[PDB]
Every structure is written in C-alpha cells, then in structure tokens.
Amino acid sequence: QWQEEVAAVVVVGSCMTDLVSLTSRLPKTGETIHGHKFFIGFGGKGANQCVQAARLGAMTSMVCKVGKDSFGNDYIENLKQNDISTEFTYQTKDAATGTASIIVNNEGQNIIVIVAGANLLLNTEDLRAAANVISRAKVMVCQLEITPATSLEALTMARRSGVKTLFNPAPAIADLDPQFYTLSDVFCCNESEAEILTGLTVGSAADAGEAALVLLKRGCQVVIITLGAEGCVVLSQTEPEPKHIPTEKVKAVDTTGAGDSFVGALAFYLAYYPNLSLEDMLNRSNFIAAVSVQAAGTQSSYPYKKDLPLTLFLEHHH
Amino acid sequence: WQEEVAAVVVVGSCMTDLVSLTSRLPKTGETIHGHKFFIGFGGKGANQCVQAARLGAMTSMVCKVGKDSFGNDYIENLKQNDISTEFTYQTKDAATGTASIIVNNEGQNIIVIVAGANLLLNTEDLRAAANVISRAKVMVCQLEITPATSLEALTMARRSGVKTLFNPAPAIADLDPQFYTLSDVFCCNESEAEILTGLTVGSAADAGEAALVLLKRGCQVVIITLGAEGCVVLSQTEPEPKHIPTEKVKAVDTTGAGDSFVGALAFYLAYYPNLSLEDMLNRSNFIAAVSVQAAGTQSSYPYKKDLPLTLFLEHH
Ligand code: NA
Ligand code: NA
Numbered sequence: 001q002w003q004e005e006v007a008a009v010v011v012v013g014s015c016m017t018d019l020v021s022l023t024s025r026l027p028k029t030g031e032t033i034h035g036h037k038f039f040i041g042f043g044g045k046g047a048n049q050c051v052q053a054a055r056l057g058a059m060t061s062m063v064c065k066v067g068k069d070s071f072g073n074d075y076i077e078n079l080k081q082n083d084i085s086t087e088f089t090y091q092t093k094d095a096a097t098g099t100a101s102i103i104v105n106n107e108g109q110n111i112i113v114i115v116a117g118a119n120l121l122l123n124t125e126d127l128r129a130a131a132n133v134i135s136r137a138k139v140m141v142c143q144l145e146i147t148p149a150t151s152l153e154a155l156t157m158a159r160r161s162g163v164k165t166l167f168n169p170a171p172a173i174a175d176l177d178p179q180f181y182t183l184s185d186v187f188c189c190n191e192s193e194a195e196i197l198t199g200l201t202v203g204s205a206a207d208a209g210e211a212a213l214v215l216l217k218r219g220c221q222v223v224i225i226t227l228g229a230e231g232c233v234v235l236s237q238t239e240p241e242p243k244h245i246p247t248e249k250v251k252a253v254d255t256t257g258a259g260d261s262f263v264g265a266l267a268f269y270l271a272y273y274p275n276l277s278l279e280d281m282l283n284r285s286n287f288i289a290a291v292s293v294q295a296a297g298t299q300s301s302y303p304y305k306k307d308l309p310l311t312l313f314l315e316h317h318h
Numbered sequence: 319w320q321e322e323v324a325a326v327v328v329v330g331s332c333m334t335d336l337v338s339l340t341s342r343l344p345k346t347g348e349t350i351h352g353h354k355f356f357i358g359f360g361g362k363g364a365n366q367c368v369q370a371a372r373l374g375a376m377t378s379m380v381c382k383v384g385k386d387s388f389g390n391d392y393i394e395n396l397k398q399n400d401i402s403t404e405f406t407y408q409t410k411d412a413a414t415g416t417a418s419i420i421v422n423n424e425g426q427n428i429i430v431i432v433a434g435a436n437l438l439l440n441t442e443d444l445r446a447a448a449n450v451i452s453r454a455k456v457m458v459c460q461l462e463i464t465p466a467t468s469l470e471a472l473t474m475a476r477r478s479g480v481k482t483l484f485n486p487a488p489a490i491a492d493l494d495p496q497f498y499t500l501s502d503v504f505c506c507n508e509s510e511a512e513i514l515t516g517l518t519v520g521s522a523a524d525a526g527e528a529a530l531v532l533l534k535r536g537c538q539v540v541i542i543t544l545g546a547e548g549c550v551v552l553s554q555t556e557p558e559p560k561h562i563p564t565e566k567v568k569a570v571d572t573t574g575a576g577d578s579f580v581g582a583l584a585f586y587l588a589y590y591p592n593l594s595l596e597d598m599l600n601r602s603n604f605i606a607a608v609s610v611q612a613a614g615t616q617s618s619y620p621y622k623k624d625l626p627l628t629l630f631l632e633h634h
Contacts, residue, residue, distance in 0.1 A: 019416075026345075027428045033429070033430055037434075070388075109346055113352045
C-alpha cells in the first residue's frame with residue numbers, strides 16, 4: 001500500500017509576528033506620531049526557512065512554540081496553509097507569541113523591538129516527542145531565535161541519527177558555544193554575523209573568505225558566508241580555498257526575508273537533491289532568494305516550485 | 319422581537335494597543351530586544367462605551383474595524399461587554415486601528431498611531447444607524463475618526479433631540495467651531511483645554527478661565543477635567559466655575575481614566591437625567607478614580623456591582 005513521504009526537512013526554531021507601522025518620520029523619545037499604514041506579517045527565521053523549503057515542494061515539520069493568543073492561533077493556521085506539519089508546534093499560556101515590532105519611514109530607515117516571548121519556552125521535553133520524526137528526516141535546520149541550549153540539543157539529536165545539520169547562527173552572539181561548530185555539517189551566516197562571530201571586519205567577498213576560514217578551523221565541515229544580493233562565499237574541509245558564487249544585479253523591490261529564503265532553499269536541495277555539488281545547490285539557492293527580493297511581504301514573496309524555472313528542479317551537470 | 323433599545327450611542331474609534339517594554343528606547347537604525355509584549359483593547363470611543371456599559375447602560379458602538387484578526391477580536395471584546403455591534407463595520411480596505419508603543423523602565427515612551435479603518439467610517443455608514451440614534455438618550459463623539467463623520471453624528475442626534483456629549487481628544491488648535499455649537503456637554507482635560515484656547519492651565523482657577531473661553535464659543539456646558547484634582551464645570555445658565563473634588567486614592571495605572579470619566583458621564587446623562595450636574599460629576603469622578611487603582615485600561619473600568627449602591631440611587 002502507498003503512503004505519503006515522512007518529513008525530510010525538520011526545522012527547530014522560531015515563529016514571530018511582524019508588526020509594521022509606516023511613518024513619514026521616526027519618532028524620538030516622548031513623541032506620539034501618526035503613521036500612514038500598518039501591516040501584520042508572519043516571520044521568525046525558523047518559520048520563514050520552513051515556508052521557503054515547503055513551497056519548493058519539501059515535506060516539512062515545524063518544531064516551535066507560540067502563545068495561546070490570537071497571534072499563535074493565527075501562526076498555526078499560516079503553517080497549515082503552507083502545508084507544514086504542526087505536530088510539534090506547541091502553544092503556551094506562559095508567554096505571548098514572539099513579536100518583531102517595526103517603525104519604518106519612507107526611506108526604509110527603522111527602529112525595531114523584538115520580544116522573543118514563547119520562542120524561549122521551547123524546551124527539551126518538547127523536542128524529545130519529535131525524536132522519531134527527526135531521526136527519519138534528511139536535514140535539520142536551526143537558528144538562534146530560541147534558547148541556544150534547545151538548538152544545541154536538536155543538532156545533537158540529528159547528528160546522533162545521521163541527519164544532516166544546517167545551522168544559521170542568526171542573530172549572531174559573540175560567545176557562541178563551540179559545540180555549535182562541531183555539530184554543524186553546514187554552517188551559514190551573513191557578513192555582519194560573521195563579524196560578530198570572529199571579531200573581523202567583512203565588507204567584501206575576499207574579507208568573507210578570511211572570516212570563513214576562521215570558522216572552518218573552529219570545527220565546521222562547510223562554511224557559507226552570504227553576501228546579500230552579491231551571492232555567497234563557500235569553503236569546506238575538502239576544499240578549503242574560498243569560492244565566490246556570484247550573482248547578476250537584479251532590481252530589488254523588498255529584500256526582507258531574503259536571507260531566510262536562501263537558507264530554506266539550501267535545506268530543500270540538501271534534502272531532495274543530495275547528488276548535486278554544493279556549488280550547484282548554492283547557485284540555485286541564490287537564484288531563488290533573488291526571486292523573493294522582487295516582491296514585498298517576506299513570506300508572501302517566497303516563490304513556489306510551479307512559478308520557477310523547470311531547470312531548478314532537474315539535473316544540470318549530470 | 320423585544321428590541322433592546324440603546325440609550326447610549328457612541329460614534330467613534332477602536333484601536334488595538336501594541337506594547338513592548340524595553341530597557342532603553344531605540345533610535346534610528348537600532349534593533350533591540352525588549353523583555354515583555356502585551357496587547358490591549360483601546361480607542362477613546364470603545365473605552366467610553368465600555369465604561370458606560372459596565373455601569374449598566376444599553377449601548378451601541380458605531381465604528382469601523384478591519385476584516386482582520388484584530389478587528390474580529392475587537393468585535394468579540396465589545397460583545398463580552400454587552401455592547402451592540404450592529405453598526406460595528408468591518409472593511410477590507412484598511413487594518414483595524416493600531417497604537418504601537420515602546421516603553422522603557424522609567425516609563426518614557428515612543429508611540430505610533432495608525433488610525434486605519436477608523437478613518438473609513440463615513441456618513442453613509444451612520445445613516446443606517448439613524449433609527450438607533452434617534453431613540454437614544456445620549457450621543458458621544460471624540461476626535462479619533464474623520465471630523466466630518468463626528469459632525470454629522472452630532473447633527474443627527476441634535477435633530478432628534480438626543481443629548482450630545484463631545485470629547486475633543488486628542489485636541490487640535492484649529493478645531494471646527496461647529497463642534498462647540500453642536501455640543502450639549504463639552505468635556506476635555508487641562509492640556510486639551512490649553513491646545514483649544516491658547517491659555518495655560520495649571521490649576522482649577524486657570525481651568526475656570528479656559529472653560530469660560532470655550533463656553534462663549536457656543537457650548538451649553540463645559541467641563542475641564544483635572545486628574546486627581548477632580549473637575550471644573552460651567553454652563554450657560556450657571557457660568558461661574560465650580561470645582562468638584564475627588565477623594566485621594568493610591569494610583570496604580572491611570573491609562574484610560576479620562577475615558578472612564580467620560581463614559582460614566584454618558585451613563586448618568588442617559589439614566590439619571592434629573593440628577594444635578596454637580597452630583598453627576600461627583601459620581602463620575604469617583605468612578606474614574608476607581609479605574610486608576612488597577613492596571614490595564616478597559617480591564618480597570620469598574621462594574622456597577624463593584625461600586626457603592628448610592629451611586630445608583632436618587633432622592634425625589
Ligand atoms: Na521580498
Ligand atoms: Na487604570
């Protein structure tokens with residue numbers, strides 16, 4: 001008898017509600033101003049990654065914790081509408097759904113206040129129920145928007161079952177636990193996160209190569225430093241010379257969430273196209289992220305398989 | 319079949335309060351982590367309506383929210399407080415109104431209001447409510463929806479003999495003078511009075527002088543509220559200012575206390591029309607002073623059963 005594929009991509013990480021007010025000018029202390037418009041959106045790195053992987057066709061499972069509040073109820077509905085398993089999406093009355101409140105002016109300058117909230121209450125017991133699902137997956141994906149101890153335990157669970165680990169140390173912290181390096185099959189961050197992690201400055205592809213080598217020697221198997229619109233730089237234990245995977249300048253409409261589109265695409269390729277070279281996967285993941293920058297609205301900008309070139313889902317070199 | 323006739327009609331605003339607590343206020347380009355977030359139901363219109371309802375008024379909230387979660391939840395909030403939502407409209411054309419607040423530990427804040435769907439409440443929307451308005455005792459308006467809409471609600475009320483209670487909040491320096499001539503009772507606070515009149519108001523006496531400027535612009539009754547100091551009242555027939563005190567209470571959270579006063583006053587005007595204005599304002603001051611002893615805006619507004627029975631008695 002036929003049955004559905006089990007989840008090949010498991011994401012253990014965050015959900016946040018984006019609360020966006022547009023204004024003419026940014027307020028300062030003591031001020032009340034009237035803005036033009038307000039936007040709510042579904043964000044959080046974990047969920048964003050998961051939504052991009054799902055839309056490419058991955059079978060995914062989101063392990064996370066939201067509030068027993070309207071925001072959390074709505075986030076669950078969002079995951080379902082994107083065909084994501086919520087078997088291990090947990091709700092707690094002990095905190096509100098995490099929030100990223102943003103005030104932004106017409107130039108796109110902003111003030112942002114994050115309250116991690118229920119994300120920080122995702123614990124070991126919560127993960128242990130997912131041990132079997134994790135053990136049958138192809139890729140585990142973590143960031144640093146939940147308790148770091150909880151991400152460390154999810155990478156540990158994956159690694160003990162032979163499951164590929166994709167770790168996005170974002171947002172980055174200067175004293176990152178060095179177990180994260182050892183436990184990461186693929187360690188992927190952006191320029192400013194690389195600076196935080198290494199103490200070096202990173203303003204070009206060459207700089208990112210130097211920073212990537214520092215991280216590699218701390219115990220990573222593959223290090224990728226993303227360069228926003230400019231592509232990425234990659235090195236590995238097998239090929240420690242840095243390689244810049246460049247891109248063509250596209251006209252950006254809204255880049256919010258593009259980093260997570262890149263990560264979620266890389267997760268999809270790692271799980272479903274394991275015989276592609278890493279270089280080929282990064283090329284394709286760069287292209288997909290670049291699709292997301294041509295439309296507004298973060299998750300709403302993430303492309304579906306059916307709208308993307310057929311060749312992204314076929315062999316190219318073999 | 320057994321209509322409940324609403325005695326108090328509020329035509330005004332609903333807003334969702336979105337509050338993040340932080341160590342410090344962020345400035346341009348900065349991202350910070352705060353330590354708590356919470357949501358509340360606000361908007362001066364709804365606040366006022368809520369308080370009047372909890373005193374036992376049959377109320378109807380004429381307002382517009384989004385077809386979004388905030389709006390659906392606001393509607394439920396109104397129903398839980400026993401408020402008619404017959405003319406609570408929902409629109410896809412904008413989001414429910416929002417007040418996004420960032421507050422540090424010292425209590426200093428940054429606030430961004432998006433009026434949103436509140437501005438889309440138009441004169442056609444009110445015309446469907448003509449019959450409800452015409453059977454009410456009191457009509458209550460503020461300045462958080464389009465002014466033209468409030469003006470038309472005051473006009474409709476006045477055409478049917480319905481008492482008009484107008485709260486010019488937040489205040490604007492060049493307020494349309496029609497608002498004075500359409501108001502049976504005009505109620506604002508000290509800093510709103512300053513904005514309206516160009517005068518300084520730091521004491522009950524100063525408020526009396528400001529209240530007289532507003533009275534002469536065409537109001538019938540003017541009340542200037544003074545927070546813990548009570549209020550000052552004047553009228554066309556008794557133009558001498560009268561200071562109505564409030565007995566001292568320990569404040570826990572004063573947010574919404576002005577709306578509590580105004581919603582109480584609406585209740586008394588509708589259900590206790592033979593009480594002297596002085597006795598109404600005594601009782602309304604007490605009620606608002608109850609609200610300041612608890613946190614959470616609408617969640618602080620007392621019910622009838624939490625108050626002394628004498629607030630709901632009347633001599634011959
Ligand atoms: Na985008
Ligand atoms: Na209060």
